[PDB]
Amino acid sequence: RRRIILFPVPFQGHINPMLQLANVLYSKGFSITIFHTNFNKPKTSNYPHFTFRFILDNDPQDERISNLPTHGPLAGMRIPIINEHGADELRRELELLMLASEEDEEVSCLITDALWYFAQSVADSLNLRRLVLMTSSLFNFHAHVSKDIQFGFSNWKQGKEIFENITKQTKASSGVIWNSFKELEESELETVIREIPAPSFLIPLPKTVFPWLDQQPSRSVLYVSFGSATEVDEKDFLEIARGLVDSKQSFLWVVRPGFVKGSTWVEPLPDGFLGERGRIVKWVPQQEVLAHGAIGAFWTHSGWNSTLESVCEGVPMIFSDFGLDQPLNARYMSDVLKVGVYLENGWERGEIANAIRRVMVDEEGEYIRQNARVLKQKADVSLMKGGSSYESLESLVSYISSL
Ligand SMILES: C=C1C[C@@]23CC[C@H]4[C@@](C)(CCC[C@@]4(C)C(=O)O[C@@H]4O[C@H](CO)[C@@H](O)[C@H](O)[C@H]4O)[C@@H]2CC[C@]1(O[C@@H]1O[C@H](CO)[C@@H](O)[C@H](O)[C@H]1O)C3
Numbered sequence: 001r002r003r004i005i006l007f008p009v010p011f012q013g014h015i016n017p018m019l020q021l022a023n024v025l026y027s028k029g030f031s032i033t034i035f036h037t038n039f040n041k042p043k044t045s046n047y048p049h050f051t052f053r054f055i056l057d058n059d060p061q062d063e064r065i066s067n068l069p070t071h072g073p074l075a076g077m078r079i080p081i082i083n084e085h086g087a088d089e090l091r092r093e094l095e096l097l098m099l100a101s102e103e104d105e106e107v108s109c110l111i112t113d114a115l116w117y118f119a120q121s122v123a124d125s126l127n128l129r130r131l132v133l134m135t136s137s138l139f140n141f142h143a144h145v146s147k148d149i150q151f152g153f154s155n156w157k158q159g160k161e162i163f164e165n166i167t168k169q170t171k172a173s174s175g176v177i178w179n180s181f182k183e184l185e186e187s188e189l190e191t192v193i194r195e196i197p198a199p200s201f202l203i204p205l206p207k208t209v210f211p212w213l214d215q216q217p218s219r220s221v222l223y224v225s226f227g228s229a230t231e232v233d234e235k236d237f238l239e240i241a242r243g244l245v246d247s248k249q250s251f252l253w254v255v256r257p258g259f260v261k262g263s264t265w266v267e268p269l270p271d272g273f274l275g276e277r278g279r280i281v282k283w284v285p286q287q288e289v290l291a292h293g294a295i296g297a298f299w300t301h302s303g304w305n306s307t308l309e310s311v312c313e314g315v316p317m318i319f320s321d322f323g324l325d326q327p328l329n330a331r332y333m334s335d336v337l338k339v340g341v342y343l344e345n346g347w348e349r350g351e352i353a354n355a356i357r358r359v360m361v362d363e364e365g366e367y368i369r370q371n372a373r374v375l376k377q378k379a380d381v382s383l384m385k386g387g388s389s390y391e392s393l394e395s396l397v398s399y400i401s402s403l
């Protein structure tokens, strides 16, 4: 009857929330098409109820779109190229799908990542309403729209121009879905919502057996995962390893193959690393691990969705920055939400070990765990029938029908 088209940005903290949004909407009775680049294409057999359609970089990519690291900060150069060049092809794919539409179905709206600001005038050209998904925090929006990091950004010409384009095309959209809940960022709400005429909807999107974990005492394991796009130099990998050892905590460390530049997997690890404490794996399902009673803390990339998934399960964090990430976001988590510790000095064994001990062992760290557990309760209540997130979602579903 009603189909929604979703068009995510193809990177860690963008894909997952858009897919989760797809699942929510599927469960409210919408059919789902996902438009996605061939680059970082998700695993489609894991979402058999969605139609996937690959666009924008099909077979003959040709140019620099064909070059370009697949990992680290420069991978994202794909995004400005598509914002600049992708309009006519996005338009064609939208038309092809409307032409093949079955007689009993229609397309309700297009939902894009906010970073895909080019999509607004394309949607407008076809008389299709576009909603936007903000995959990151309300605070992040507030900090850029209105002290040291703010002046770092005022010095950054590309960052500022992209942000102005995002902002204008978000305001022009028919609605904004934020990956958050009201009780998490209650001071940001009024100000952010108000700056944007398009109606806002806050929905916290993050809401199998581990034999080795099952044998560990509660809150005894450090879970370490930097996600799918990140990379480090060999020196940094070794400092991460030295830090884990010196913490003397038990750890489950997820290391993607390719995470260490210049090696397939973990060749640089010293002989007899691991011992009786550590476990290393290539991949695990993160939400499931975070829900396990063995996990005492989560050392993560400072991405917002990772962070939200952790507080939604009551797990405190250690935060590391990668690529072009601004310290802003980990500061907010550390110093305002107070649900983890930020590593200020890159990768250094002493700081690493201290942060692990602070969150997992130290008496004076327990406030952090507690803060995390309060947030988890609030998330639970918000999603409760009657709660603010439950009602936001119900209103969005009805609004989509009214477009
Ligand atoms: C206000 C914002 C607009 C903004 C839009 C994306 C954009 C860029 C980062 C500028 C460069 C090109 C481009 C396209 C870029 O490289 O984008 C990055 O591409 C990576 C893949 O190489 C992805 O992994 C990252 O998610 C993506 O940011 C730009 C400026 C700063 C930025 O805020 C940042 O927002 C982030 C939250 O969204 C927050 O984590 C950062 O701390 C914060 O500084 C983001």
Ligand code: NA
Pocket (backbone or CB within 6 Å): 273, 274, 275, 276
């Ligand atoms: Na061992």
